[PDB]
Paper text:
In bacteria that live in hosts whose terminal sugar is a sialic acid, Glucosamine-6-phosphate deaminase (NagB) catalyzes the last step in converting sialic acid into Fructose-6-phosphate. The enzyme NagB exists as a hexamer in Gram-negative bacteria and is allosterically regulated. In Gram-positive bacteria, it exists as a monomer and lacks allosteric regulation. The monomer folds of both HiNagB and PmNagB are conserved and resemble the E.coliNagB open structure with seven-stranded parallel β sheets surrounded by eight α helices.
Author numbering:
A (entry chain A): 16 to 234, 239 to 277
B (entry chain B): 16 to 236, 239 to 282
Write the structure that this text describes.
């Protein structure tokens, strides 16, 4: 596992966006051989998407032959609703880069069969082979996406009931009314994330300090990253408050070395 | 508890020596009212003694009315032996400062009764009231002086067997022979150290990082964790000793003690 200890959220956004762009330009995707990218939502990914747009506007990268898969989506909320994950991804990223609609994949939470929709997504992932880079966040309790904190490492795409903690957090997006937050969501599994060639986790904020410590130092779903072949965690200084001094010191020198 | 996170061993030596001198000059000791100082041995205390000698030669401090009590001493080893803690204290400190012979107190490991000698030592401490400042080190496993790892917090001065790990250590001082290291020592107890008004522990080196973590962050357990129940405990460390502490712990004490960090930077 690689830990990138940066100072602030802006540096985390710029570094993570630059890492994605560098890999896409190293890969050089085509119509026959696209670059497959897993994508999250939320406040911390939002700053990366803004930085990715800045690099696109600078002519530094093209998403024409980039295929994307998003982590999750609300059930029962129309995709046209402003607070859907479809709306988040288009409003904050897709509408500003040269991505192709047919290469965009976001789970549909309003199908005739939620179980069937989840398996279709898993098969669309397999049809491309593997995801080359899956970007994600972590929750305060170390949970990935909408998977339960204690999800099996083999878990796959499925429907989940939102916990009481996720409803009150996401309530700010729904007029500060917990009864307006969708009660269900479709979410990729932990096994779905680990099947990617690379996982990049963005961890910012004091409230994520225990999660980052569990991810980096502990033996908390995010701890499964320790057995992943190519795991990258990009954090800011407040997120490192629970790490040991020697841990931050070693990775701070390792990155300055590159 | 205070943690003084400094950069290197020299700064730990200079700061700890300056702290001792400042307290002595703040105390203003006399014959009737002496300053009582507890003293350890070893490589890390040695640099503090060297720094204290420079401050004495500069006219910054006098030890004329300072009474000292050492932590421990080997049993069965003559005090004149080069590896006794008598020889360590005189060669590296007492022979270079203006301390008075009658104000020096070191456990005698060759008396006719080890229990009586230890009780006399405790009584001698009590006759002065309290030790005003007890300087000490810590072992890699958190032990203090020669107290066993699971020593009682109320334990007093007594004769003790050196642990197997203490026996393999210190073997370099006795011809690289574990069988030639003295098997017993007289040592102050954990309660004896805790009775002092103030305790200052010197913690340097990567090998002491686990010990510092137990002392500063761990729950009371590691004899050094007994410092957490003391009224005024001070730990002076260098950067390698902090490697096992949490970032927020070093961050907190670097800002809190920023004036003490700047004084030797």
């Amino acid at each position: 596992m690689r830990l990138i200890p940066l100072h602030n959220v802006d540096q985390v956004a710029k570094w993570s966006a630059r890492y994605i762009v560098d890999r896409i330009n190293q890969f050089q995707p085509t119509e026959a051989r696209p670059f497959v990218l897993g994508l999250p939502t939320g406040g911390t990914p939002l700053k990366t998407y803004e930085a990715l747009i800045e690099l696109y506007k600078a002519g530094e990268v093209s998403f024409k032959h980039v295929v994307t898969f998003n982590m999750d989506e609300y059930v029962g909320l129309p995709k046209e609703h402003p607070e859907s994950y479809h709306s988040f991804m288009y409003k904050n990223f897709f509408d500003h880069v040269d991505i192709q609609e047919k290469n965009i994949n976001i789970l549909n939470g309003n199908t005739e069969d939620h179980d069937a929709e989840c398996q279709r997504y898993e098969e669309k992932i397999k049809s491309y082979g593997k995801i080359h880079l899956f970007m994600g966040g972590v929750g305060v309790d170390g949970h990935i996406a909408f998977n339960e904190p204690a999800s099996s490492l083999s878990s796959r795409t499925r429907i989940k009931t939102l916990t009481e903690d996720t409803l009150i957090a996401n309530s700010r997006f729904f007029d500060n009314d917990v009864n307006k937050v969708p009660k269900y969501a479709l979410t990729i599994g932990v096994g779905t994330l680990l099947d990617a060639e690379e996982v990049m986790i963005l961890v910012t904020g004091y409230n994520k300090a225990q999660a980052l410590q569990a991810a980096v130092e502990g033996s908390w779903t995010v701890t499964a990253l320790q057995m992943h072949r190519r795991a990258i965690i990009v954090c800011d200084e407040p997120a490192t408050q629970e790490l040991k001094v020697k841990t931050v010191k070693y990775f701070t020198e390792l990155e300055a070395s590159a």
